[PDB]
Amino acid sequence: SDRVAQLTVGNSSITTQEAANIVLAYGEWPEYCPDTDATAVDKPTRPDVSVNRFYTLDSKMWQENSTGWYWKFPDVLNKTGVFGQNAQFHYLYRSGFCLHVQCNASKFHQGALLVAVIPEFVLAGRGSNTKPNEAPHPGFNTTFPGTAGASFNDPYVLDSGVPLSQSLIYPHQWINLRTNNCATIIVPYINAVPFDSAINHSNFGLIVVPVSPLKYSSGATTAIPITVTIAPLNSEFGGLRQAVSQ
Amino acid sequence: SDRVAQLTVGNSSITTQEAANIVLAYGEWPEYCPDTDATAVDKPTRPDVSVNRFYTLDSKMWQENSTGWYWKFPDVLNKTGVFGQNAQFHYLYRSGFCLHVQCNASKFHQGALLVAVIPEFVLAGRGSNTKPNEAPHPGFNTTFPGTAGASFNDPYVLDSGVPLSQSLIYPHQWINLRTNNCATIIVPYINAVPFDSAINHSNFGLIVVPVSPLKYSSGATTAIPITVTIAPLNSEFGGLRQAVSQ
Amino acid sequence: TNINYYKDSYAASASRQDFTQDPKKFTQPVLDSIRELSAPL
Amino acid sequence: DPVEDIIHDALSSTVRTSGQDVNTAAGTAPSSHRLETGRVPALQAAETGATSNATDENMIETRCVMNRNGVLEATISHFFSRSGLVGVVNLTDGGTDTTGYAVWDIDIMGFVQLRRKCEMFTYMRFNAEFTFVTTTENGEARPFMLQYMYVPPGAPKPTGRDAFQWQTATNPSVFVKLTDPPAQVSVPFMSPASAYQWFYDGYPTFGQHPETSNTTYGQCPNNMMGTFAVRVVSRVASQLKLQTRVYMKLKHVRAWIPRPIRSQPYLLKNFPNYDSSKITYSARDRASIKQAN
Amino acid sequence: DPVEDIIHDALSSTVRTSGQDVNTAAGTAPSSHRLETGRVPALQAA
Numbered sequence: 085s086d087r088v089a090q091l092t093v094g095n096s097s098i099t100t101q102e103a104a105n106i107v108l109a110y111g112e113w114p115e116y117c118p119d120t121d122a123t124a125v126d127k128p129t130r131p132d133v134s135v136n137r138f139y140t141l142d143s144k145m146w147q148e149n150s151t152g153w154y155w156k157f158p159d160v161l162n163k164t165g166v167f168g169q170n171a172q173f174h175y176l177y178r179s180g181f182c183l184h185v186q187c188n189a190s191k192f193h194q195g196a197l198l199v200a201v202i203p204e205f206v207l208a209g210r211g212s213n214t215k216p217n218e219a220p221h222p223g224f225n226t227t228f229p230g231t232a233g234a235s236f237n238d239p240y241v242l243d244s245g246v247p248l249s250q251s252l253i254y255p256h257q258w259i260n261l262r263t264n265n266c267a268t269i270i271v272p273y274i275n276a277v278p279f280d281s282a283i284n285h286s287n288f289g290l291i292v293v294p295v296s297p298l299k300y301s302s303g304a305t306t307a308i309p310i311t312v313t314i315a316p317l318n319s320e321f322g323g324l325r326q327a328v329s330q
Numbered sequence: 331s332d333r334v335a336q337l338t339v340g341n342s343s344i345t346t347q348e349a350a351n352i353v354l355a356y357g358e359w360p361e362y363c364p365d366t367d368a369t370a371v372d373k374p375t376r377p378d379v380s381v382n383r384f385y386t387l388d389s390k391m392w393q394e395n396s397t398g399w400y401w402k403f404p405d406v407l408n409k410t411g412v413f414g415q416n417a418q419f420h421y422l423y424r425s426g427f428c429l430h431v432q433c434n435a436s437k438f439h440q441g442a443l444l445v446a447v448i449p450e451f452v453l454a455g456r457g458s459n460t461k462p463n464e465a466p467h468p469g470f471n472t473t474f475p476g477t478a479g480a481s482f483n484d485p486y487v488l489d490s491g492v493p494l495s496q497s498l499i500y501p502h503q504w505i506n507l508r509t510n511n512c513a514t515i516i517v518p519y520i521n522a523v524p525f526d527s528a529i530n531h532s533n534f535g536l537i538v539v540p541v542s543p544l545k546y547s548s549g550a551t552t553a554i555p556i557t558v559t560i561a562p563l564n565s566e567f568g569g570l571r572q573a574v575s576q
Numbered sequence: 577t578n579i580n581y582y583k584d585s586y587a588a589s590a591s592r593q594d595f596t597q598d599p600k601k602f603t604q605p606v607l608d609s610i611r612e613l614s615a616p617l
Numbered sequence: 618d619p620v621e622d623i624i625h626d627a628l629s630s631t632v633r634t635s636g637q638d639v640n641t642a643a644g645t646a647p648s649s650h651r652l653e654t655g656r657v658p659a660l661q662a663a664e665t666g667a668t669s670n671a672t673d674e675n676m677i678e679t680r681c682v683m684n685r686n687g688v689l690e691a692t693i694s695h696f697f698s699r700s701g702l703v704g705v706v707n708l709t710d711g712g713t714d715t716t717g718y719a720v721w722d723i724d725i726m727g728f729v730q731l732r733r734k735c736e737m738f739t740y741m742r743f744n745a746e747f748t749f750v751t752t753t754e755n756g757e758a759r760p761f762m763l764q765y766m767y768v769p770p771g772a773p774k775p776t777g778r779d780a781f782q783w784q785t786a787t788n789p790s791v792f793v794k795l796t797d798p799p800a801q802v803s804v805p806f807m808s809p810a811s812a813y814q815w816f817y818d819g820y821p822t823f824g825q826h827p828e829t830s831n832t833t834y835g836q837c838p839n840n841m842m843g844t845f846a847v848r849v850v851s852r853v854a855s856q857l858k859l860q861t862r863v864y865m866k867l868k869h870v871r872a873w874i875p876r877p878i879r880s881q882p883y884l885l886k887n888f889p890n891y892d893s894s895k896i897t898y899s900a901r902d903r904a905s906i907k908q909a910n
Numbered sequence: 911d912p913v914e915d916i917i918h919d920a921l922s923s924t925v926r927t928s929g930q931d932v933n934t935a936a937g938t939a940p941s942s943h944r945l946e947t948g949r950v951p952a953l954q955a956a
């Protein structure tokens with residue numbers, strides 16, 4: 085009576101039967117820009133159906149010695165979908181996402197997964213050198229991995245010098261393979277500015293960490309994937325211009 | 331709260347705990363012959379307890395290469411039960427059946443079963459010859475198998491030239507070994523005449539087809555049976571006479 | 577308005593067409609009339 | 618009062634789906650996203666035999682459409698309103714054939730295109746509108762006259778061209794010319810039963826029934842309804858090779874207990890016998906599973 | 911009126927946690943034993 089779940093945005097319609105409890109980040113639904121705070125004097129655009137779909141990212145396989153994965157938003161959607169072709173043509177942007185991540189496993193398997201959004205998820209150069217002109221820094225494809233989503237190198241400090249043990253201050257939901265095969269988050273627009281660029285400023289991150297390692301007795305499915313389906317809500321766009329890849 | 335089920339007719343009392351949802355054929359309960367339509371001028375008889383019992387047919391074992399089974403009604407009950415001794419002594423007859431079929435399997439097994447009643451379930455000679463005097467025809471024991479119930483020869487066309495894919499227009503209920511181990515149908519009297527003979531005209535058939543083959547990893551119960559329990563409701567009888575076997 | 581030139585009933589053509597459809601006889605022939613958007617089991 | 622058990626059930630032996638009249642197509646109202654647990658129309662249970670009621674409004678961001686598409690032509694009344702071929706006779710009135718008459722028992726199962734339609738419904742009840750088109754083997758019309766007598770079951774069948782049965786003081790007959798528009802006749806529901814039956818899971822008679830060849834199987838007589846004879850109106854033979862098609866319409870039709878459509882080809886008339894050696898698979902064969910043409 | 915689809919969402923585009931002012935620490939009331947099924951605050955779902 086609570087385990088089922090029906091979320092439908094746009095022409096999509098997702099359902100999960102075993103996972104339960106939608107967690108809403110910070111108790112505020114995603115809403116449009118109010119009149120009394122916007123700065124973009126021109127009219128913004130509200131497609132509301134073409135863009136507000138459940139785009140599905142690629143499957144990431146979970147191994148018994150896996151480390152973790154992460155993505156950036158709205159960076160994962162700039163080459164694909166009408167939302168991609170809408171962000172390349174607009175300087176300004178505002179939206180609120182409905183994260184949803186899936187990890188299917190059998191009732192004989194074990195394991196858990198920490199799923200959390202990370203606002204303003206910067207990364208950190210991995211090196212003891214403090215020379216300012218020779219400082220190690222993460223590359224572009226490392227911090228903006230795109231639709232694929234790169235992996236971690238040391239997840240215990242989130243590759244940012246912040247311990248994972250405290251990482252539940254952020255909105256989160258646990259996938260645990262005994263009771264739920266899926267999780268979901270509805271996050272509003274979190275930014276100190278009413279609008280922002282879409283191909284420069286990522287609003288937040290997402291982490292999917294194998295805290296408890298996948299362990300199964302030999303003789304079962306060995307290739308467990310993880311898929312994340314993402315869906316913006318109450319999107320905005322303004323300041324039309326030419327295309328810009330990056 | 332819906333998975334349990336308690337059907338009790340006559341001195342019997344059947345229960346099934348895993349199977350759910352009684353399907354009633356065509357949305358009309360079984361009822362007696364109304365006054366304004368009957369033709370048998372003599373009084374008919376209404377035992378209502380001796381005959382309205384849950385008679386259990388024989389168990390049919392399900393193998394991994396099985397084809398199907400079928401029965402005919404009320405032909406399966408003419409040698410057994412007080413209903414048998416009542417149909418042999420009466421030219422006319424009317425009743426409405428409460429089919430119920432059971433197939434128990436473990437939660438590690440897989441398989442499905444198509445259960446459906448077939449009104450006026452004629453059969454078909456299996457042969458390319460169209461010579462009218464040398465036409466292949468089904469034998470008596472093949473079309474009236476009795477309490478045992480014969481098997482199919484080609485179930486994809488129901489041994490009647492009708493594809494099984496369309497066979498769900500009829501009232502049906504699926505046994506599927508992941509969620510329900512049993513099924514049930516309550517069927518009224520379906521006949522273009524108010525009464526009929528009981529040892530000549532079978533009102534309908536029943537089919538139990540292994541659509542999805544029983545598959546289990548080796549090391550489990552290999553002999554899966556299928557039992558069908560049948561129960562007439564609102565029976566009638568008229569035109570008493572001598573015995574008639576067939 | 578349809579008219580018959582004979583005093584028998586079976587000489588008419590389309591004496592009364594009728595819209596009457598009951599999907600509940602075949603599509604949902606169930607005892608426990610399930611809810612329209614809930615969990616059936 | 619003498620005993621409660623007999624008055625209880627008799628009082629409770631009373632009668633134990635009020636569908637509406639749908640004139641148009643079904644419209645739709647809008648619908649927004651709804652993100653809530655407990656309420657799901659997708660995850661139905663088709664195993665209960667019910668149809669899933671996953672309506673379009675309940676899956677996607679639909680719109681408002683006030684439809685207007687008419688459902689008038691899909692009803693059974695106008696589905697069988699088309700006339701169709703039923704039989705042919707071969708009245709080979711010539712020098713060799715010294716009969717001058719041809720009798721044909723009514724069996725609509727003889728031709729497939731009308732047969733496959735009525736197979737969809739197990740019990741039917743209707744009134745018929747027969748039509749006897751008339752012509753020669755060359756398609757030519759000629760100045761001649763024909764007689765079309767219905768010979769019910771039990772009637773004396775005609776014996777020749779000058780037979781006394783053509784006096785037809787009780788049997789209905791149609792006297793018509795060959796330079797005439799086709800004769801057309803309405804026919805009522807003349808079954809001895811309450812409704813026609815295209816199927817019969819048994820035998821007409823009692824007694825033994827063999828297992829080597831069962832020619833009496835599946836032959837109910839309630840639909841078997843006599844013969845229909847034709848001659849040219851003449852006591853001496855005129856040399857012409859005649860062949861009259863007979864057509865019927867179904868009107869005031871009332872069906873019951875829908876039946877699937879037969880896919881396998883027909884081989885006989887009164888028996889639905891297919892062939893095990895050539896099972897005609899309904900679907901065309903594709904390349905692989907994931908190669909939708 | 912010309913088309914319902916545009917006025918429906920616009921009317922329903924309105925605004926979609928009234929926490930109190932806590933001056934002190936949180937007190938507590940007594941509680942006795944309660945031996946009953948169905949009601950459990952321990953077995954949560956973190």
Ligand SMILES: CCCCCCCCCCCCC/C=C/[C@H](O)[C@H](N)CO
Nearest residue numbers: 723724725765766767789790840841842
């Ligand atoms: C003088 C008028 C000639 C036309 C009258 C011929 C009798 C027509 C009776 C129609 C009976 C129902 C239609 C028959 C269908 C099939 O032949 C049978 N149901 C079984 O084969």
